[PDB]
Amino acid sequence: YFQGGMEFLVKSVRPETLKTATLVLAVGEGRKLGASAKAVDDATGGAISAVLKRGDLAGKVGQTLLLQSLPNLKAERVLLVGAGKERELGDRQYRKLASAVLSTLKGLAGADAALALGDLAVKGRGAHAKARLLVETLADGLYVFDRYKSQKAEPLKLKKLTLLADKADSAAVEQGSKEAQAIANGMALTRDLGNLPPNVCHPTFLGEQAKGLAKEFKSLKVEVLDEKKLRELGMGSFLAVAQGSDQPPRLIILQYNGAKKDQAPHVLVGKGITFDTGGISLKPGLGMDEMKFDMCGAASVFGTFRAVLELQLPINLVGLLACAENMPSGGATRPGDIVTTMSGQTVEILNTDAEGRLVLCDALTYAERFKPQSVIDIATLTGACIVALGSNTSGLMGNNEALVRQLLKAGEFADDRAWQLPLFDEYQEQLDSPFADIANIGGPKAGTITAGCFLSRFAKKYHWAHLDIAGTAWISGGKDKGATGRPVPLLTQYLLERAK
Amino acid sequence: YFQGGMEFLVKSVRPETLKTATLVLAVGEGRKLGASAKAVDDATGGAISAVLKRGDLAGKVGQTLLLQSLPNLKAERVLLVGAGKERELGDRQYRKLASAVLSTLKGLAGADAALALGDLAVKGRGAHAKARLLVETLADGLYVFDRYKSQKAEPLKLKKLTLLADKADSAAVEQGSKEAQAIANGMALTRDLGNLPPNVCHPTFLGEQAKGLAKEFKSLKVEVLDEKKLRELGMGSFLAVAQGSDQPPRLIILQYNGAKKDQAPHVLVGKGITFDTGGISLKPGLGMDEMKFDMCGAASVFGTFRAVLELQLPINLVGLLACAENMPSGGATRPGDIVTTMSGQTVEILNTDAEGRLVLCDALTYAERFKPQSVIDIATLTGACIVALGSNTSGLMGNNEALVRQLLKAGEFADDRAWQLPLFDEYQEQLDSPFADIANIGGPKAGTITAGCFLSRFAKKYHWAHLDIAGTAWISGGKDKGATGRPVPLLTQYLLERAK
């Protein structure tokens, strides 16, 4: 169940007799009230119709009108929210409607609210799929990160949200709500870890977080490998990234065995660069505070595990979090260094700011021992991905078409979308080095793709895919600056489908 | 009277019996309802008190709660707006309160609203001064620029705003409202001219706008000088700016004689660079669309005249709008050119992007013929002013301390503030040229000041001041991108005081 201060219930009772602090109804733009709103209007003797006739609420998506006590209702307030003029909403409009409702309710002193929104239609979504989107939007919309504020906002009075559904849909709605709550809990852990400042959130801290998660979930086993063990394993490019920082690196291994021992596991590999200065290839100063989000890949592995552990899915899951801090220093890796990866391939490190792939490639080699049926790495890897796909769609590459399709489908269902980019063999020659087996960077052309090509050289032994979340893992500026928790919804949906 | 679709009335009637679509009341945070709100609450039998006790409205500045029909009231709706917990508001909080009220009313279908806000106290402001700020904020908040949108917003239903005031204050409130309406009308003309795209708003267009203003106001006389006349006058630096563009330059002269012929006039000189590419000293591409705001100086002279003409102030006023377009071309002015200004001083044009001062200096020489008692130039002159003072405070320089103080005081009253920067003689040597009498730019140090020093060399014959509005004339980005209309409120207030 959701942990962020909200209980979500599903009930099949009549809205017009439900006791609640706020009853929420949808109002169309220039079309008749839906069945639920009409039943409530009838119960009040036409009071809602009479208000709407006065014209303050045009009915555009997300517009609101709040009424107090109406005759013959047990609702203390009635919140009208506009649903536009279309027969069906798209996902974006449904989310906008839900967020407008939540924003209003947050500011009220009501301890609960009941959503009578079952008459809304959303393109391509039945009861379960609508509940997944609605509850995830509501629950994630409650997220707060204020532990470093001396002045904290007043706690919400709102503590309970009831979804009204016809009895024939209530089981699907309940299922969707339960899954959405687990996803939102995972997103909240991901966002917390992403938002923590890098002087607190370093690799050792992430190791202790993993141990704490195992304390909470007896089904989770955790092992944390330090720099001595990494050197024993021959993890040369991983160590090269870490060596310039005072902070020691960590390889965190999470294991959950929800299925029979004969089922091959799915492996999630997360880039956990807790801060990325670029190293000797130093980044510019402007906006470099957002490099604390360079561990959002690893954070999303935490969050996906958190959701899976709550749902107790019948799957075998492994998490590999490759965490290091990338700092300049008198002992840092230099451009031109050549290192031997755990696979034995030598890499010429042309640019020390292309370091995510250097911790990932050793983790991908490590993943071979699990004989996985799928391996997915998640990383804030290339600014080129933002040029290619922006901030709303993650880049996706892989060496197996069926797995890539499974991830695309999961992202569509989750409304946490990705988009495939090709790993054509012609791109690989961009990584040729006169000195070593591989150069760690290509040119300025196709940067997201050549990063995927680099990783692919370590993933040939299994079905593998790669999510570039450089654009989707956080919001850069404004009031809403901070980690997003993506791609936890995509990944959790992928695993939900693999668990059937 | 305000021309943008709003009637402003002042009335001294009881709020609790006033017929209106929406009655607006202030609610303090954690302090008793004020006298007006308490009288309305009493009339409803405690209905407003009873709602507030439920806690939906914390009372923070600008928070709102909208009620429908309440017992025994003639108001169709009651809008409660939070006024915070302080005894007195500052100007910023008063504006925020007013804007929140207006934003709510805009979205309602009510044709009018009545503001019962007389109990609000604002630091240092009596009835007249509060009405000046309130009505100007409301009227300017109604501004719309949509002539290039194919899809225009629905017209507002709100067409009338009534300010309720005690009979002892109603004359002061009425005076403040009348002046604020004239200022807002002037701001709207300024903002229109600033927001027009530069392929429409060129110097010839501004000349026709001046002629149109004289058609509307019989007290205004207008003369428009073309490039032939400028060359006859010897206006060499003005012509040098204009010569690279296909668009001919214009010197627009506005004259209003509201006082006896023995009163020396006040002169406003406006920089009207209708687009500034930098010329041969070409600007970078990023954000260069905002260079259509490089005529906001001249636009503010239009707007100040528009307000003065409506108020029929007993003063003699002259406007000089120096308008040109600054373009690269095969005949454009080159860095290193030396030109002879109308004053006879030679200027070495080191950078063709410091062109505002080159049209202004010839206009300042031209102003000598009016034997003025004050000359104020207004210009979007230096990006250095934004570094120095940001986007909320205009830079102010001058050669006469009394005039500078008068302008500072006017800006404080108007809440359209400026701040003096010094024209110490030591800064002048930055404009030394080995070849000419003056260089048109100093170094990278004290750029706002050295621009003022350059202009001061043309203003020695009269009391003069210079407003750098590079930061305050427009908003750069976001939903509210566009011209602001500043410093029309400061300038109009200055002239209101000079008219007493």
Ligand SMILES: [Cl-]
């Ligand atoms: Cl169903």
Ligand SMILES: [Cl-]
């Ligand atoms: Cl640890």
Ligand SMILES: [Cl-]
């Ligand atoms: Cl250690």
Ligand SMILES: [Cl-]
């Ligand atoms: Cl985007």
Ligand SMILES: [Cl-]
């Ligand atoms: Cl799916």
Ligand SMILES: [Cl-]
């Ligand atoms: Cl008074």
Ligand SMILES: [Cl-]
């Ligand atoms: Cl003209």
Ligand SMILES: [Cl-]
């Ligand atoms: Cl001409």
Ligand SMILES: [Cl-]
């Ligand atoms: Cl600022």
Ligand SMILES: [Cl-]
């Ligand atoms: Cl004043």
Ligand code: NA
């Ligand atoms: Na719609």
Ligand code: NA
């Ligand atoms: Na949509």
Ligand code: NA
């Ligand atoms: Na990097």
Ligand code: NA
């Ligand atoms: Na990185």
Ligand code: NA
């Ligand atoms: Na390239």
Ligand code: NA
């Ligand atoms: Na206050």
